Amino acid sequence: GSKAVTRHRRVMHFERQKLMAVTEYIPPKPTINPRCLPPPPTPPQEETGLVRLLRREIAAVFRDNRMIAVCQHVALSAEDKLLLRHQLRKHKILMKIFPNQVLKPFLEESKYQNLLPLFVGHNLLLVSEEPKVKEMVRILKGIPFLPLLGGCIDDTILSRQGFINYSK
């Protein structure tokens, strides 16, 4: 005979095994499954401090930049990018980068819509305050694989050939 407590796991008298198999847990079974039901109710996101900061800063961005150009963000060594930023310092021209996520839906509201196809790729926003186009193009002429897709100048959407014209 085996003691009340043992380590070999202790085979149960058959009537008790039946007793066990009868009392097992049976989980609640749905009529229709939840995921195959229609979409869940709406969990709407709300503006953080960062979202308000970006909406306000990007709102100011179209105010201060007289020439807003869209230059495709391209991978250069820290050397090339810093030298680039220093030359842009030398003509006083500015460069700024934004998240696509918060930059996209702002321009999908009213004014600047025509920029939407240019922002699906990797973008870099060239900020030009009291600019001359010849000088902005001066640098993009030096490095060939750093293309300029243009964009907004004084509320008008303009492209590469247009900038070739405004420079001359």
Partner 1 sequence: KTLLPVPTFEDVAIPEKPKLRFVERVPLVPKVRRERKNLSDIRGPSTEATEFTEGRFAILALGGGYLHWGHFEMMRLTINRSMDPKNMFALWRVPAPFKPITRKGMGQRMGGGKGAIDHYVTPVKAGRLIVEMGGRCEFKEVQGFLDLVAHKLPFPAKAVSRETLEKMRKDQEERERNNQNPWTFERIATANMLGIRKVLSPYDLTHKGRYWGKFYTPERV
Partner 2 sequence: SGMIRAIVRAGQARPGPPLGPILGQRGVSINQFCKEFNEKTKDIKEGIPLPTKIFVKPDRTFEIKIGQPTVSYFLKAAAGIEKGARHTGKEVAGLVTLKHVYEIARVKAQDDAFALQDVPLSSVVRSIIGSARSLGIRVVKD
Partner RNA sequence: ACCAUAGUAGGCCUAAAAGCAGCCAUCAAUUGAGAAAGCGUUAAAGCUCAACAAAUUCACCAACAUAAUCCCAAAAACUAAUA
Partner RNA sequence: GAUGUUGGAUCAGGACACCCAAAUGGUGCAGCCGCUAUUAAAGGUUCGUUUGUUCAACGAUUAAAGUCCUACGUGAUCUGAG
Interacting residue ranges for partner 1, rule: CB under 8 A: 3-7, 9-10, 12-13, 15-16, 19-20, 22-29, 48, 50, 101
Judged by CB under 7 A, the residue of 46, 63, 78, 145 near RNA is 78
Alpha-helical runs (H) found in 2-149:
14-22, 49-64, 78-90, 100-107, 133-142
Distance CA 151, CA 125 (A): 10
Least spacing, CB of residue 131 vs partner 1, in Å: 33
83 binding partner (options partner 2, RNA, partner 1, none; Cβ < 5 to 8 Å by kind): partner 2
Number of H helices, E strands in the chain: 6, 5
The least distance separating RNA from the CB of residue 29, rounded to whole angstroms, comes to: 18
Query: Which one of partner 2, partner 1, RNA, none interacts with residue 20, CB within 5 to 8 A by kind?
Result: partner 1
* Dihedral sign (CA 147, 86, 131, 165): negative
Question: Any binding-site annotation on 71?
Answer: no
CA 40 distance to own-chain centroid: 25
Q: Smallest distance from the beta carbon of 34 to partner 2, in angstroms?
A: 53
Dihedral through CA 30, CA 35, CA 39, CA 40, nearest 10?
70
Least distance in angstroms from the C-beta of 30 to partner 1? 12
Please say whether the beta carbons of 124 and 167 come within 8 A.
Answer: no
Q: Which is nearer to partner 1, 5 or 36 (CB)?
A: 5
Q: Which residues bind RNA (CB under 7 A)?
A: 73, 75, 77-78, 82, 96-101, 103, 119-120, 122-123
